[PDB]
Subunit: 439 residues, 3 copies
Amino acid sequence: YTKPDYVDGRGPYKSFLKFLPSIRWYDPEHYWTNGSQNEGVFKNEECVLCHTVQTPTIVKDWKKSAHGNLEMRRGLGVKGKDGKPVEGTVGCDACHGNDHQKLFMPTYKNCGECHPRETSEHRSGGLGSHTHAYTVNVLEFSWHVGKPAEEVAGCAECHAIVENRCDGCHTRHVFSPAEARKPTACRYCHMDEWAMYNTSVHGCLYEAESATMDWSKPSKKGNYRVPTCAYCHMQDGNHNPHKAKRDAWIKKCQDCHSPRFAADKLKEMDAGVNLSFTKWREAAAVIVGCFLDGVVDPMPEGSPPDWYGHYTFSLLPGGDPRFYATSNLERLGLEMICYLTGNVYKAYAHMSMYNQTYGNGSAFEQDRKLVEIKTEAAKLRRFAAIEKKIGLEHKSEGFWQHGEYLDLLPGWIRKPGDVDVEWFKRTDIPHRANADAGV
Amino acid sequence: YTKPDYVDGRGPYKSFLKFLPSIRWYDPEHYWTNGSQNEGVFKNEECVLCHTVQTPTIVKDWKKSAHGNLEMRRGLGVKGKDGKPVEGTVGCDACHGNDHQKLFMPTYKNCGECHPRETSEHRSGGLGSHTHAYTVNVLEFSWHVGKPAEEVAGCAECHAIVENRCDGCHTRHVFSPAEARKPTACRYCHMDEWAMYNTSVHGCLYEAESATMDWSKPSKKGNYRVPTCAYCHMQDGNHNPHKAKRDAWIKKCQDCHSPRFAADKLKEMDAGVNLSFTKWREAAAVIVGCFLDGVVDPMPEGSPPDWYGHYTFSLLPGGDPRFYATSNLERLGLEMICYLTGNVYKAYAHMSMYNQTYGNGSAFEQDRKLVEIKTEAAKLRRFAAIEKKIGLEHKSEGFWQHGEYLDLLPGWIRKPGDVDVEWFKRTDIPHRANADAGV
Amino acid sequence: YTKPDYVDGRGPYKSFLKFLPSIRWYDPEHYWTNGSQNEGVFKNEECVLCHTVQTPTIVKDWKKSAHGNLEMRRGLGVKGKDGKPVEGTVGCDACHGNDHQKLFMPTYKNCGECHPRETSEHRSGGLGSHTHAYTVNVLEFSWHVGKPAEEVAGCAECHAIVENRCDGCHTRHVFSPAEARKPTACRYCHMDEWAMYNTSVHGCLYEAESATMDWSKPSKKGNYRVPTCAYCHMQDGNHNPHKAKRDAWIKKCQDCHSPRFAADKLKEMDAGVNLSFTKWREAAAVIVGCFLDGVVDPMPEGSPPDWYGHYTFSLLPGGDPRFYATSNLERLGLEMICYLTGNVYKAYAHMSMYNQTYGNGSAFEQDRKLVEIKTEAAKLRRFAAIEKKIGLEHKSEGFWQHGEYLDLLPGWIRKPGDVDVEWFKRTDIPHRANADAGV
Ligand code: HEC
Ligand code: HEC
Ligand code: HEC
Ligand code: HEC
Ligand code: HEC
Ligand code: HEC
Ligand code: HEC
Ligand code: HEC
Ligand code: HEC
Ligand code: HEC
Ligand code: HEC
Ligand code: HEC
Ligand code: HEC
Ligand code: HEC
């Protein structure tokens, strides 16, 4: 194994966090440098008919877009950068630049010149939304910072497409709202939301009607028979995704349904999640219970240190819950709470009858995982008992602590004074709760 | 944890079986009560243009239906309730009623007034079909009655849509046969039938042609190139799904294929299932073999009592085969026979080449599960051996028997004389074979 | 259990290898015999209008094909068998024959009369391609020969459709290139390539546009916005799927993308696979490490003999890596290298962001499997330690070695001098590296 080329990180853990050079297409404001052979300052017309030979699809798309094709316009009345409206064609130079040796890759800031509302709404969201997916939910996230860059390359890419740039639900060089309204524009990131929507009758009607139904109309009351990702969350074309919030859902459901039917189905979600929590309470008592007696193989000391730089239990306040570089009991615990408990919430919400019970990450799988946890707990307790009686001092195996991949973990290189807590002190952005956060 | 609002059960175990209030939309004959704020007796025209503002999609659908749009009719010659035919529009009041304080939710009985044939054929099916999915395969089913209502909410809902009401394969307010013919109208319930159909070339041709092919024609000989769920099982529009039954399939396959090709492929199914049974015979001998020696942790007594109310082995006559609240050896056993052995049958039948071998619930996974069972058996036998020699009396752990979810199980509250066996004594409906059935 | 009817094998292990009679539709050159009731020599016109009643779909397809419908032709200038071009209709007798008692089932040889280029390109491929999928990757393959015929029926069928006959990507009786261009024509065999393509944005755009986009155009530069299976691998309609090979991909990607973007994404693939290998190096050291100490339950001698006929370790040169009829430690090892390590390569290549990390057969699952391997290793080492101290001689269990399915394995009947090494000596076809290969 040889270490690939790395560029320096950007988050609060930037002292040791690294990125692959490909990050330039994902954080253009921060990592973009010129790398074009071609030179010269060109007019838009020169850009198009030179790229028709070189990169034909972009041009073909651009001609299928409102930016490039004036006939394909609805007279929105867009006013870009200056007050004056845009009547001419929005070309390649408008988005990328005129000089080839000074090309810039566009973000939400570049789009914000022409489209203020869609950008303002995009920046209005808080923690967990599209607004803070890269800045917070990548740079401060445990599994991303706790792993080498090439492993979590897709993690940085996926979370950054929706935050930084605008071509998430919009193809790239067509920017069609009809394409954006489709569930396909959402599921390549949301994958276990897609499985719930697919196994529900809402998703089934999509596949049945998508070829026939009119996609040109905006996601508004009456306009659509089949609900999509964009219809439910991006209400009336809004670019931002407990009685006040519940009645808001019932009113949206009242587009096609009775409010009584809407209320009953959302009450099913409450009752379904409540019973799934009791399954977790059983598991948590078992796993933590094994830690009290110290029968867990291996113990946190016998394992490699976590990304914080401590030898702490994963499923315990302070420690980092993980699936990697930990004991099997801790792995099966994290598997239940993160994946399975979260997916049951998604199953009841998206009205998936199968995934509520029999499906992937379901209540029946929660029962299966509960057995897996209990059997693991039974195994460790039987071993310890036998060892105690015969008079054997068992020590955790060497392969738990050290390995070719395990040595590459950043947990070994964590030293006091490497955290930039001034990043955490920021008021403009929300923050993830971490042990070494400072604040 | 707090217990949600429950309404009383209906099956033979109605003494302890409960349901969520949402069951009213699924068993309207039995659980529907009025819950509308709005009052007054209205004409159909008043119903439509008041609901256009409130619930627009229903109205838009109703106008896209033959019931609401007379232009969209094929002159079937429907004769509803009375002998006289229906020439006028079938409105909202025809299905739901005139008074808002006295609204009724329609079943197969309400549809049976106008459509006698489709209802008669629907009621003609026996055990395991759509006919007895809720009455028998929910109220008498082990995993449904053996679990709290909010967990198995979707179980009651899914099985009841196809039995009680008619909007299973038919959207709801469009009732399009073209939509019903599509596999999407079937797979939201049938999910592992869908995976087999999808990974087969039959399902692949569906996705390739669905946008282009004519869906308006009935499922008859010649009419379709690509076979669907509705084409194979609902032959010639029949609303009801060994040489006599085999030749019946070959003749149906002869619509597109050679009978020799049809016979060879169905012979593959016979040979494929035969070899999958020998894998089960190996597993069964191992799991039951561990019960003879009493090495299973935990033993039925160490586990919580089953839904019947006994401390019996799961994979043994009398006992209830389950994945929950049992030992790992018993869980892996049930996983193989119910899911994997059943799915192999589905894989060979639906001509899925991948799912016959490499797929989910396949022959190769049966091999994987066989190892999982054998390793579990090896673990228990090695433990017992060591314990015996050193002189240790091992008792099953406490977390097996008792837990927050485990205490909520109905197995603890089973008392003699709670079974309504007069339900089981019925001649009009088939019955599931249970231990405490009485007959 | 009773053994189904078997026909003799054909590969180098033909002494014990068997096939189901259904192989006649898959190896027609080798296994096809007449089995038709109907007799007589007929003209093409007699074939069509007799099969319109009997097998209507074939006829309807044939009329929708260029072979049967002259109007549906692009004037290719096909010249069949003789030099003279084909102007008349290519009928049923042209493909199958005139006499019913002397019908032949077509291969690539039968198609090669009319279409020389598409056949020549089909035969140009080497090991691992469509060219040698049945002859080499079935008859010489370990899991196929090491299992009874009815279990690996689909294995023979799937691998033979693409090699022997031509109706793989082409329906059967339509032979539409538009249908062949679609990913659906590929994924029924390629299933974990499909999951990677589906979860990527390339596959998402397919489902979004397939109903609208023009499929009639050939897979060429500019012609398509959305890349498919056929677009990427079958470049410019070529019927054959490190700087020289890398730049070839970048140029193909340059159809829609910047070469810098193309280079960066393929560099991500290199770095992603490199880190996945270190996870394997950890696993391999652990599993083989357990074999040195002899703590593996069961040991190769305690297991049934492999398909070669030896009692060797699976994950060791000479031995056969398998998931069946082996220890759990060996199973989990094979699961990682074959499925998971191979799927990570597929995930990075097909630009799937989800399947790079969280998906099925991913880097995060590699971490999960690494724990599973380590826990299994920990279990075996703890057992052996306890046994040694107390003075117990542990022997592997009987159910590992013998069973109803295990007895049916060909490993028991392997005798010296059963291998046809003259098959392996062939120069016209590449060969799989086996222990008993001879050369
Ligand atoms: C900055 C990053 C963004 C800009 C600028 C725009 N978008 Fe979007 N977008 C999305 C959807 C689903 C729609 C269709 C809404 C509907 O149902 O009607 C749109 C639409 C637009 C429009 C058209 C609005 C109009 O009134 O004409 C514009 C001008 C537009 N978008 C610009 C989806 C998404 C999305 C989800 C993943 C993101 C991140 C963005 N859009 C971001 C931007
Ligand atoms: C009571 C519960 C039901 C009534 C009343 C009807 N159906 Fe269905 N249905 C289904 C399919 C797949 C079709 C299309 C059949 C074809 O291929 O041609 C239909 C069609 C009908 C029709 C039209 C028949 C005609 O000759 O015009 C009527 C009037 C009709 N259905 C009424 C599917 C299903 C289904 C599967 C899930 C169920 C449960 C029902 N239908 C139930 C009813
Ligand atoms: C022998 C086994 C084969 C013959 C003879 C032909 N094919 Fe194919 N084929 C495939 C695709 C994806 C296409 C479309 C290519 C495109 O994008 O334009 C085709 C096309 C043809 C054509 C038309 C070529 C023309 O210039 O008109 C012919 C005559 C043809 N094929 C004959 C895919 C495949 C495939 C993949 C699974 C296989 C095995 C074959 N084709 C095999 C044959
Ligand atoms: C013909 C001589 C061209 C003209 C005029 C313009 N572009 Fe170009 N561009 C051209 C080629 C052959 C390439 C690929 C090789 C390379 O230099 O990278 C490109 C590349 C781009 C890129 C990607 C550059 C990168 O950093 O990866 C962009 C963003 C781009 N081109 C845009 C662009 C614009 C906006 C132009 C008009 C002013 C323009 N190009 C002119 C060929 C030619
Ligand atoms: C990939 C680039 C995405 C696309 C396209 C869409 N979404 Fe997304 N979404 C994505 C990420 C990485 C995140 C952040 C996850 C986190 O919690 O850190 C989100 C967030 C959401 C949310 C908010 C979830 C919450 O805070 O509770 C919603 C409601 C949501 N996404 C829905 C959604 C819809 C409807 C989309 C289609 C238009 C969509 N997303 C696109 C990744 C991506
Ligand atoms: C793109 C295909 C993804 C990859 C790669 C990863 N993430 Fe993601 N993220 C994705 C979605 C759309 C969602 C679901 C959001 C929802 O509302 O449930 C998420 C979810 C996770 C969460 C976990 C939970 C929570 O605590 O909020 C976070 C914040 C997050 N994602 C982190 C993250 C990182 C950086 C990844 C690599 C280690 C990981 N994601 C993969 C899909 C995208
Ligand atoms: C306007 C005043 C209305 C007229 C006239 C009719 N309906 Fe209605 N309906 C209306 C509203 C605002 C609501 C939702 C609030 C509520 O009372 O539940 C409804 C609801 C229904 C329902 C669902 C009732 C339930 O139990 O959940 C049904 C089945 C229904 N409406 C049907 C219906 C019919 C058949 C009518 C004609 C006689 C009719 N409604 C008239 C508003 C109005
Ligand atoms: C959900 C509401 C369903 C829809 C829509 C369809 N089916 Fe179904 N089917 C469903 C259930 C709950 C059951 C009973 C399961 C049991 O065994 O208890 C069935 C049953 C069948 C059967 C009979 C199986 C047997 O007895 O061997 C068949 C053949 C079947 N279903 C096929 C089928 C088809 C082709 C459908 C589309 C028109 C369809 N079902 C719709 C649930 C649901
Ligand atoms: C709707 C999405 C479903 C949910 C929820 C559950 N069931 Fe179901 N059932 C479904 C289908 C369509 C099938 C397959 C039928 C086939 O022919 O194989 C079934 C299968 C099960 C069976 C198991 C086997 C047999 O013994 O017949 C039964 C009878 C049954 N279903 C019971 C049942 C209950 C009540 C559920 C919750 C505990 C369970 N189902 C979930 C899909 C639908
Ligand atoms: C009517 C009398 C027919 C004429 C004339 C032809 N075929 Fe036929 N064919 C017919 C039937 C009723 C059947 C099914 C019963 C059977 O004999 O198998 C067939 C079958 C075929 C088959 C499949 C045979 C097999 O081995 O499975 C083929 C390949 C076939 N038919 C082709 C064919 C051709 C090319 C003809 C023209 C010369 C022809 N058939 C004439 C009925 C009749
Ligand atoms: C089923 C009949 C298949 C269809 C249809 C397609 N492919 Fe395939 N492919 C199939 C097999 C059985 C194999 C051999 C697997 C082996 O390694 O033994 C292949 C091989 C390929 C390859 C070569 C892989 C390699 O050697 O590295 C490629 C690139 C490939 N297949 C792609 C591919 C595409 C793009 C297809 C659509 C046109 C396609 N295949 C069809 C099985 C089948
Ligand atoms: C059709 C649905 C399949 C079945 C059944 C099996 N095989 Fe296959 N094969 C399939 C594909 C398209 C691929 C992927 C090719 C790629 O490039 O990755 C394969 C892969 C395997 C390989 C494994 C790896 C390698 O060493 O090349 C081989 C050679 C192979 N296939 C063997 C084989 C046999 C005979 C099967 C039964 C035991 C098995 N395949 C199932 C899909 C098709
Ligand atoms: C109907 C309206 C829909 C549809 C068609 C989809 N979703 Fe959602 N979704 C919906 C609800 C009512 C909820 C629950 C919200 C609540 O009451 O708490 C959700 C939930 C989600 C979530 C989880 C976010 C959270 O924690 O609150 C996500 C990420 C999400 N939905 C995304 C999503 C996607 C991608 C969809 C398309 C496939 C989709 N949803 C469909 C309502 C509806
Ligand atoms: C874009 C171009 C695509 C698309 C749309 C698909 N694939 Fe591929 N594929 C592509 C690349 C660049 C690679 C890696 C090749 C390399 O550099 O080594 C692959 C890889 C495969 C493989 C593995 C073959 C190998 O070992 O090299 C297979 C079997 C394969 N692809 C098939 C495949 C199928 C069936 C697709 C449709 C769903 C598909 N690909 C999409 C490039 C691209």
